[PDB]
Design a protein around this ligand. Structure first.
Ligand SMILES: C[S@@+](CC[C@H](N)C(=O)[O-])C[C@H]1O[C@@H](n2cnc3c(N)ncnc32)[C@H](O)[C@@H]1O
Ligand SMILES: Cc1cn([C@H]2C[C@H](O)[C@@H](COP(=O)(O)O)O2)c(=O)[nH]c1=O
Ligand SMILES: [Zn+2]
Length: 405
């Protein structure tokens, strides 16, 4: 039985996705077929209701020099984060000498807008290759994990931060207590710690189990985040639901009693409690639907092969590692996955070993079907690939249900 990373309570498992590889390791075709594996399973803490994995992968195995995810590969997410930055610049960073720290700045997608406004900032990005992309934009970055000690070091030399922001990063961090202690050390007394990550409500609603993989340790909800804040000295004071990444919530934490929570916080809490979001029965129902999706997706893929129709995938997401390894999908059923990230191209997907090719290679003559792993980017992708669909090529989706369109 595993101890909750937030409160030490007991965590009860509800979903076992089996042996999985690291999601963001893309091997050259000639490399030895040996990968690190671990058991991917998800549970819910009994005391604070935090939904979390039952095995941690060590951080250095995931985040390192060759971490391959480039945030700026999505035009939607570029606009999303530039607007968030402008919003901070108009609200929380209007002082005489403001400072914003970003945990997980990646290639600089959000901090470039802060740097272009002349505002003092620091990104923490432990994956040095993408850190260097951000530095080439003029962004100040430390190639370090944010945790208590490194936060202590920044408070000592740089002073208090008015905003600490994390997007798609806090959920990646099992040592959230250490992060919160760092935020306590580093945040101004009237500052905010704002983070946005995939939302448990949307994952349950859409059965989007591919949001569960090595790098997604936590599936936050307003209920669990409220408890986490409270148990660590802070207070959930705003929440905002966002469409990006399959559905997220952006949570705003402040020092306790310093600000009054928006009505939105109580409203979302009440909705989660009404829909019994975090009840073990709800979470096990989700687990049953995950199995139903596996069985229908494999049945379809095998039917398509028996009917002589060609199938590829689109988007070498980290998420897809869960789909192809839980479902047992490899190159005999999906022959290639198309992806815009150079560091992923001419490599093989983890565990399943499907070849990855540049997106520019998805062109006439098109395959009959494309399994859309980057389903959270559907609109942006389909807008760039109208020729495929006009030629009669169709998308296979597995969220919220297996269907073709
Ligand atoms: C999925 S990416 C998100 C990047 C970007 N914020 C976005 O939303 O697209 C998660 C990032 O978190 C970084 N990361 C992991 N652990 C971290 C930590 N303790 N502190 C800061 N960044 C961390 C990773 O290296 C990776 O670049
Ligand atoms: C938005 C977009 C993403 N991709 C790829 C880039 C990333 O490897 C993956 C998306 O990953 P993400 O869903 O974690 O952001 O899909 C494309 O190939 N084309 C696109 O238009
Ligand atoms: Zn707990």
């Amino acid at each position: 039985p595993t101890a909750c990373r937030v409160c030490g309570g007991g965590v009860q498992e509800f979903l076992d996705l089996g042996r999985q590889p690291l999601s963001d390791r893309f091997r050259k075709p000639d490399e030895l077929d040996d990968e690190f594996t671990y058991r991917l399973a998800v549970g819910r803490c009994d005391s604070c209701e935090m939904v979390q994995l039952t095995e941690e992968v060590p951080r250095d195995l995931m985040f390192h020099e060759v971490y391959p995810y480039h945030s700026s590969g999505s035009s939607v997410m570029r606009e999303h984060f530039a607007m968030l930055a402008r919003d901070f610049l108009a609200t929380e960073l209007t002082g005489p000498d403001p400072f914003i720290v970003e945990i997980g700045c990646n290639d600089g997608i959000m901090l470039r807008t802060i740097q272009e406004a002349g505002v003092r900032h620091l990104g923490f990005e432990p994956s040095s290759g993408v850190a260097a992309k951000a530095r080439e934009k003029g962004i100040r970055v430390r190639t370090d994990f944010f945790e208590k000690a490194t936060a202590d070091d920044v408070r000592r030399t740089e002073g208090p931060a008015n905003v600490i922001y994390a997007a798609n990063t806090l959920c990646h961090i099992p040592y959230v207590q250490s992060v919160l202690e760092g935020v306590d050390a580093l945040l101004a007394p009237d500052g905010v710690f704002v983070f946005e990550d995939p939302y448990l409500g949307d994952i349950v609603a859409k059965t989007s189990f591919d949001q569960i993989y090595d790098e997604h340790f936590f599936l936050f909800s307003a209920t669990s985040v409220q408890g986490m804040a409270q148990r660590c000295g802070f207070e959930l004071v705003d929440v905002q639901r966002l469409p990006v990444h399959g559905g997220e919530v952006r949570y705003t934490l402040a020092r306790q009693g310093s600000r009054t929570p928006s009505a939105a916080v109580a409203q979302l809490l009440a909705a989660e409690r009404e829909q019994e979001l975090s009840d073990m029965a709800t979470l096990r129902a989700f687990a049953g639907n995950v199995v139903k999706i596996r069985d229908e997706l494999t049945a379809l893929l095998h039917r398509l092969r028996a009917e002589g129709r060609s199938v590829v995938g689109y988007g070498a997401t980290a998420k897809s590692a869960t789909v192809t390894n839980f479902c047992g999908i490899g190159p005999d059923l999906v022959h290639s996955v198309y992806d815009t990230t150079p560091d992923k191209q001419n490599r093989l997907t983890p565990g399943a070993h499907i070849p990855v090719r540049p997106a520019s290679a998805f062109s006439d003559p098109y395959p009959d079907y494309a399994l859309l792993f980057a389903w959270n980017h559907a609109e942006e992708i389909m807008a760039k690939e109208q020729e495929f669909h006009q030629a009669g090529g169709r998308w296979i989706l597995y969220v919220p249900e297996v269907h073709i369109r």
